Structure formats: C-alpha cells, structure tokens
C-alpha cells in the first residue's frame, strides 16, 4: 500500500497521532525482536567460546 | 397535491440511497468504521467550541 504523504492525517481511517503511535509501535516491535534474538544468541552455544 | 406527494417520495428516496451508498463507501475507503468514527469525533469537536 502507498500513501504519498509527508505528514498523513487520515489513511485507512487512522488519525495523525494514531499513525505516529503505530510507527513507534513498529520500532518497539523490531527492537524487541532484535533484543530477544541477541539474548538467544548470547545464550547460544556459539558464544560460549 | 397528490401528484406532488408521489413525485416527492421518489425524488427524496433516491437522494437518500445516494447518501447511504456514499457513506458505506466512505467507511470502506477510510478503513474501519470506528476510525471514521474517531475522525467524526474530531470534526464534531471542531464544530463545537471545544
């Protein structure tokens, strides 16, 4: 999907603040996944040596 | 007067059907009904003094 907006007010029925909160939510999601992945890696066998 | 009544019913109801079709298309276009309800809350807010 495309929106072509520099500051989108309403797209798919979402407010300007709701979009910002959604981007913040995606950033937090990705950072959480990366963090858990690096925890599993720090507990991995390959990092013991 | 009766002529006007029968003609008015059809003209008015056609205008209504145009309105409802446009509303549902607006909901499906914007996304969820509740999102359009939120923007409706904001526009009603700007319509009052709030």
Nearest to B31 by CA among A33, A35, A8: A8
CA A35 to each of CA A29, A40, B4, B13: distance values in angstroms, whole numbers, following the listed order: 10, 9, 73, 60
CA B49 to chain centre: 23
Kindly provide the resolution of this structure in angstroms, with one decimal: 20.6
Q: What are the helix (H) ranges across chain B?
A: 2-30, 33-47
Q: Is B28 left (phi over 0), alpha (psi -120 to 50) or beta?
A: alpha
Method by which this entry was solved: cryo-EM
Write out chain B residues lying below 8 Å of A8, CB-based.
Answer: none
Which among A9, A13, A22 is the top mutation candidate for probing chain B, defined by the most B β-carbons within 10 Å of its own β-carbon?
A: A13
Q: Cβ separation of B42 and A13 shorter than 8 Å?
A: no
Distance CA B42, CA B50 (A): 10
Spatial distance between the Cα atoms of A48 and A35, rounded to a whole number of angstroms: 18
């Amino acid at each position: 999907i495309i929106v072509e907006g520099d500051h989108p007010s309403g797209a798919g029925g979402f407010s300007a603040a709701l979009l910002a909160r959604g981007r913040e939510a995606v950033f937090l999601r990705d950072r959480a996944d990366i963090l858990s992945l690096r925890i599993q890696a720090a507990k991995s066998r390959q990092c013991k040596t | 007067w009766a002529q006007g009544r029968e003609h008015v019913v059809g003209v008015l109801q056609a205008e209504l059907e145009q309105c409802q079709a446009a509303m549902k298309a607006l909901e499906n276009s914007v996304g969820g009904r509740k999102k359009l309800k939120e923007v409706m809350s904001f526009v009603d807010k700007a319509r009052k003094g709030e």
